[PDB]
Design a protein around this ligand. Sequence first.
Ligand SMILES: Nc1ncnc2c1ncn2[C@@H]1O[C@H](COP(=O)(O)OP(=O)(O)O)[C@@H](O)[C@H]1O
Ligand SMILES: Nc1ncnc2c1ncn2[C@@H]1O[C@H](COP(=O)(O)OP(=O)(O)O)[C@@H](O)[C@H]1O
Ligand SMILES: Nc1ncnc2c1ncn2[C@@H]1O[C@H](COP(=O)(O)OP(=O)(O)O)[C@@H](O)[C@H]1O
Ligand SMILES: [Mg+2]
Ligand SMILES: [Mg+2]
Ligand SMILES: [Mg+2]
Lengths: 117, 370, 370, 370
Amino acid sequence: IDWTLLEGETREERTFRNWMNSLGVNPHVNHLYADLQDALVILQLYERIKVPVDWSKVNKPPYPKLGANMKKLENCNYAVELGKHPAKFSLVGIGGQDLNDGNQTLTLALVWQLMRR
Amino acid sequence: TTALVCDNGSGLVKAGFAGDDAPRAVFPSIVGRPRHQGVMVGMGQKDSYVGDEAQSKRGILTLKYPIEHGIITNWDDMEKIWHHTFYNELRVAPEEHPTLLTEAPLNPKANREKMTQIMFETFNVPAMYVAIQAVLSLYASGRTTGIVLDSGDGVTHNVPIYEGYALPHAIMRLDLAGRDLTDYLMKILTERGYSFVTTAEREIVRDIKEKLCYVALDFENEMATAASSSSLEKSYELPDGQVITIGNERFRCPETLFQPSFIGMESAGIHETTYNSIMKCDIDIRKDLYANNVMSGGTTMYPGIADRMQKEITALAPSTMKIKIIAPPERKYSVWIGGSILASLSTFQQMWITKQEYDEAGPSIVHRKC
Amino acid sequence: TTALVCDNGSGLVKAGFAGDDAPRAVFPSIVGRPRHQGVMVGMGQKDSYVGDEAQSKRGILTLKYPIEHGIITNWDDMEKIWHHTFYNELRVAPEEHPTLLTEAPLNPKANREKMTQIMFETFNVPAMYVAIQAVLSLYASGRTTGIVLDSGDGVTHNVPIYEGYALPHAIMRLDLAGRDLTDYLMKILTERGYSFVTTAEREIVRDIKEKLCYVALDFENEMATAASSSSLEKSYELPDGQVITIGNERFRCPETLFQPSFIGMESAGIHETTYNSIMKCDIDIRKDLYANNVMSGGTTMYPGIADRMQKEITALAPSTMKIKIIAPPERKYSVWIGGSILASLSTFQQMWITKQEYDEAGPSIVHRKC
Amino acid sequence: TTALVCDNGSGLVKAGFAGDDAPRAVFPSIVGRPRHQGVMVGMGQKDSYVGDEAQSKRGILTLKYPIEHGIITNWDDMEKIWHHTFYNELRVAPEEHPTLLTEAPLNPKANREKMTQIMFETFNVPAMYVAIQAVLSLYASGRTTGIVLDSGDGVTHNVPIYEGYALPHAIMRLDLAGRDLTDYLMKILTERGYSFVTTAEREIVRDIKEKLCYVALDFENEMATAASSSSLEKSYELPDGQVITIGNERFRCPETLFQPSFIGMESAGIHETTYNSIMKCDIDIRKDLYANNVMSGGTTMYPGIADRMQKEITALAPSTMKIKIIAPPERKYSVWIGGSILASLSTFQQMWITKQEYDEAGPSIVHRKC
Ligand SMILES: Nc1ncnc2c1ncn2[C@@H]1O[C@H](COP(=O)(O)OP(=O)(O)O)[C@@H](O)[C@H]1O
Ligand SMILES: Nc1ncnc2c1ncn2[C@@H]1O[C@H](COP(=O)(O)OP(=O)(O)O)[C@@H](O)[C@H]1O
Ligand SMILES: Nc1ncnc2c1ncn2[C@@H]1O[C@H](COP(=O)(O)OP(=O)(O)O)[C@@H](O)[C@H]1O
Ligand SMILES: [Mg+2]
Ligand SMILES: [Mg+2]
Ligand SMILES: [Mg+2]
């Protein structure tokens, strides 16, 4: 199992990464703000906190070279929508573009709450 | 249960945990909404911008301050702002952390009651307390006797304290602070051809404040120097690459504090305000109040403010005993530091407004418990 | 089933299916009719020529560009062109394919209304949507912020976009494009003794322009190079065997883009138009607008156009910050690529103008939905 | 001798003599230069067109407005305009007649200093003075208490005055006037297929706006009337014989005054600006300020502007107090009438900025004397 200290990383982000790695995410999350931009890992974490996910609305990791950014933004928007209504999260001012652009504050605000559930 | 110390001011929001020496979250208290039209799909899902996202995308957003002159105008917005503070910035559950919030003196009671009701019925904390910003600023300085001039974004007030005893009859409140200074700066920038109207440009004007404005020790001498020479001219670069230069408005804006008539106000200067506050106190305690002048707030960050305070008060002094001005480098977070110190005290643990007291006394319990 | 993406331009028509990376059908937007007398029986049964058959038989036909400056002049002609595109080029029945078409900004509303009414009432499609060519250009580049310089055969326009939010007040349209450049080359070709009057010869001169014309980085020294030397001379062979030579008209023709006064036009160059469009936006978004300049269309195919564009903007820049312009090689089909991307999006399927919406709201539903 | 009262506005120049009831010279403030090639000898001796000769020959001239939003940008053009209005329009020597000009509030000081230097050095008039347009508007109405909302061609500003005392802190300037309305009308005219892009066509668009636009009492009811019935359509004939018809753009153009978001501006409507200005004043004088709402300028010539103004203030009024609108028929020349009245006063003869005051104090004497 990977137990290493990065050059720049708080203990909170290390706990986040270790939690998602130990929970069995399909990719290997090495950076929080560089691997969650596609919102696929967030969707994978969603069913493990008993939040149903409709995979027919999810774009697969194979992305066409045209409109891939639009597909990733759609995935982030769907993840936010799934977290809001049926999941009852407190995410004020957080949108799909924030997760797509890797906003650290709003991404940490979502992951720590995911471990809360 | 680590107590929360959230000092939400008119301009900035200061939040953190009791025991820390510095707030963990310092973001402007703004709510941003788009004013343009989005053409592509998948991006217009966000309706409001609360934290620094409003500051970053301010070009396509309109900025509104939910707190005006230490008085709430838009109660819907603090729900968003407080949820942001609790979940995005601090990332803690309010239901487990009792939160200490601050309030300016001579604030209408409905504000405090509605704020207590909102925070209890939405965030469901175990307990609460409301402390005055000036008292916390004295807690940060480790004093029990003195007069604190708290000048933040909307409220400038003086609170004299002697041996831990306050004098409400000697406490006043001046609604002249950094926001009015920014308004004056925008008004006077049109003299050089620099026009700023949109709310986004107000942030640039506040940046010009914080990078170019200073308090003149002698106003007429600085006018003479600016009119005769050109050494006071300073250049500022706009975000789009344009460069503006100001040499006189640097000290004209902060002088509105000493000369409220600059924005057409009949009030006197802050030095005169604190002198009158001390005159409202006992003659036996005026000696200690002159020797303890503690500053706080972002408005006290102009260069030369402390020397001008000393000069003006000594001019108003009986000319026999010395004047002491205290301007710690942590003035902007003195209220938060004092709140953290107070919430960390074991004696203060019995002063919290527990939820069972609220459930039986309504929002009015804060009036008797604070 | 699948969405049709057809870019009905003034000169060329780009058509295909959603999800494709390039339009399937690209033929000139012309309508050809005979202008001679048939003497042998068996060839006069064809009344009009729509696709490439008009171009191939142009020696005995008159060529009409029905779409002029992105404005519809002859509705029966685009009826024929759309029937051709749907049945002979794409060979798909419109009644089961929702079709996404493109439209230039600052286009009269009657155009969009009549086009919506016609294509629902003639082609009986289930749904429609109308996208902007500049928006689809940014879709092709995969960008959400920047100003688009789309210059096709009829319309050159700029649309500033920051975080996807467009500024209608900063959007302006210029009616100078490749057709006007071909006409100016026609006007300046008579200096060397080359005369072309027939609309068939218009396509020949357009072909000459698409091959020998280029944008000069510096125009006045190119004047000296062409007048003093012969290295800029280039030869083109006419279809009937004759060969013409142009050395100065190669780069004088594209200069009308930056010098509209060549044709007696009072408007400014494309660089100045882009500069004014950026300056009409918010100061905070101007940095990103400069940092993202997208050009598109077949008119942007002249060699050296991007270098001249960046040099002119840098001269117009505040000289402190950086300028770069995106010049992809799919510029001629960027609008179609963006249309395919948009129509392929799952979330875009809800904004198709359903035929039941049309049947109850008239042709005016297209204004509310687009 | 006789003082000269010249109102150098953004769009029109009003000139005459002190004491007169109407200006003697009213010509557009434009400078025209040829934009074509002269091929017949003996006609190209004229290079600049200042007065109505620029308006009459605009088909071959480029029209430039020297004044932009009441701010001076081209100094040679206004020197030509002043020479014209002094020697051909009024045909009087400036060196003998003191000249009284007007100036908008929140105008950069360099403008006033340079203009003062110009008319002490180019025309070297014996005396001069600079007064605010709003003050002259109150002088024309014969009032000493009230708020003045002046809207000309470049500047719209509110100036409240109580018993002859002005309140600078309640004065703000909005850069939205007839020129911006003409630009908006041109922008919305392309919806009907009417395109006018040259500077000569700008005057035609302005003429159409003047003779066909009106202020809607209720904007949404007018939307419904225009979209339902055709009684709002009106016809205008172009100089070449073409006739255009507009039914909805008539009242969409003036609505931008109350809805600046039409042109993408974050500012509020003129009614809200006046409400804020009155609220920025003392509550004791607000009673007289509301009952004295004096407007002036060519922008106040739209039909129904007074009724909409009254309705908006009444909606913004405390609902218990009376509002009065003053819209004299001489609003377009109210500034000039007030200037003539002031310069005809015997008491005003001592505030003239004499030549000797300038010769000792530089151009800065105007700031002290005005
Ligand atoms: N370096 C500075 N110089 C001058 N003024 C400042 C500076 N920093 C902040 N301010 C002013 O103080 C305000 C914030 O002060 P603060 O103590 O945060 O007020 P509040 O607690 O009411 O939000 C800012 O909005 C600005 O107007
Ligand atoms: N390599 C080239 N050099 C110069 N001009 C070109 C080149 N390729 C295309 N063009 C011009 O661009 C035009 C194509 O514009 P287009 O994008 O098809 O307009 P629309 O989008 O309205 O159909 C043609 O008329 C042609 O004159
Ligand atoms: N009857 C009218 N209806 C609508 N607009 C008008 C009318 N008359 C004049 N205007 C507009 O008012 C403007 C006149 O501005 P003006 O008051 O002359 O400015 P200044 O006072 O700065 O010279 C013109 O630009 C014109 O477009
Ligand atoms: Mg504070
Ligand atoms: Mg095109
Ligand atoms: Mg005027």
